[PDB]
Amino acid sequence: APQQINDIVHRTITPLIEQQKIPGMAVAVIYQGKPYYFTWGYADIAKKQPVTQQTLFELGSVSKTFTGVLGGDAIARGEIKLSDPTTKYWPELTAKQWNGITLLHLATYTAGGLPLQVPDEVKSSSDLLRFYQNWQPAWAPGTQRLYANSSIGLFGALAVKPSGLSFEQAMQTRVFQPLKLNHTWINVPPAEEKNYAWGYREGKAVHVSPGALDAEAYGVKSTIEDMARWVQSNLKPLDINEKTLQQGIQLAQSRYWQTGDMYQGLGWEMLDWPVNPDSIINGSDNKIALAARPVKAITPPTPAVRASWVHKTGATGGFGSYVAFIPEKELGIVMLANKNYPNPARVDAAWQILNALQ
Ligand SMILES: CCN1C(=O)CC(=O)N(CC)C1=S
Ligand SMILES: CCN1C(=O)CC(=O)N(CC)C1=S
């Protein structure tokens, strides 16, 4: 790799790992469309297993970008419309507050205050129905963005209903496989378990627990190589042969809502490039990222803007991940770690690295 890339990455990531006490980390830098890989530390401390390019990390919320793209693919297939009412795909949802709440609203956290987490008490499908039936919005639909697994999670579930496929099957066959993401999983098969890093929370080794709509909201695990390929795909959607997937990716980066200087896509979030680093750094802090904020409707949505900082932070109990890229520049980065460390530290490192290379 170019010594510039090596120095920039190492000078940035080494202190980050030290300061944040990150056990293991993998980084991919996409420079002029080509990936460059870097690994540090341990995937499994007790077994002294190092991080490698084949190490599986929990993506957490970065999963929502796959979910967004899968939804976009379903739109392109004509199987769903984002303008349709939610009740069209879930007739049992008869409570009156669901009037006027569309798939768009679910996909973009603008339904009116759906909670961050689906309650752990929800186990069966009937529990799930009861939950959404009894949910009372704090706001009118399409007025406030509140980041929520219960929102985009339900979107994912409904988006694949007409296809007849389970969410996992739709994702595998319509997204993972055509993009040759051969080491990306919703459920890690035993054959791949040896590469599945442990997460670390408070010194304890942890993996993500099963939960309602987990697959749809935070259930993807991937390697640094597949995630680099994921970024390449989202950098250059036109190079992709499957028409609907190609279109789906474009739709996922459309700008549907604005709050502050940020735009909400399907899973992906975007800002105009060049960005104010303080804005994306401070904005990633949960006190802002998880806050209720008013939205300006983008009518109609702006098609994917090449001059954008496109990104997503992700977390599970034991993992912290970040993906960012700039389509106009053929420039991107993936940061995968088996510790959930503060978002602003992730974004700061990413902007430091990409800015030096642009
Ligand atoms: C649905 C119309 N539309 C958009 O709003 C944005 C976009 O990028 N594209 C192209 C795939 C379309 S068709
Ligand atoms: C349910 C997954 N998960 C976590 O475990 C921890 C966390 O901070 N976040 C982000 C809100 C998520 S989605």
UniProtKB/Swiss-Prot annotation:
Regulation: Inhibited by the beta-lactamase-blocking agents avibactam, enmetazobactam, relebactam, nacubactam, vaborbactam, taniborbactam, zidebactam, and beta-lactam-analog boronic acids, via a covalent binding to Ser-61. Inhibited by non-beta-lactam, benzo(b)thiophene-2-boronic acid (BZBTH2B) and various cyclic boronates. Not inhibited by clavulanic acid. Inhibited by O-aryloxycarbonyl hydroxamates, via cross-linking of the active site Ser-61 to Lys-312. Weakly inhibited by citric acid.
Cystine pairs: none
Protein name: Beta-lactamase
Catalysed transformations (reactions): a beta-lactam + H2O = a substituted beta-amino acid
Entries under Gene3D superfamilies matching the protein: DD-peptidase/beta-lactamase superfamily
SUBUNIT field: Monomer.
GO annotation, cellular component aspect: outer membrane-bounded periplasmic space
The species this protein was found in: Escherichia coli (strain K12)
Active site positions, chain numbering: S61
Keywords: Antibiotic resistance, Hydrolase, Periplasm, Signal
Encoding gene, per UniProt annotation: ampC
Induction context: Can be induced by beta-lactams. Expression is not up-regulated by the non-beta-lactam inhibitor, benzo(b)thiophene-2-boronic acid (BZBTH2B).
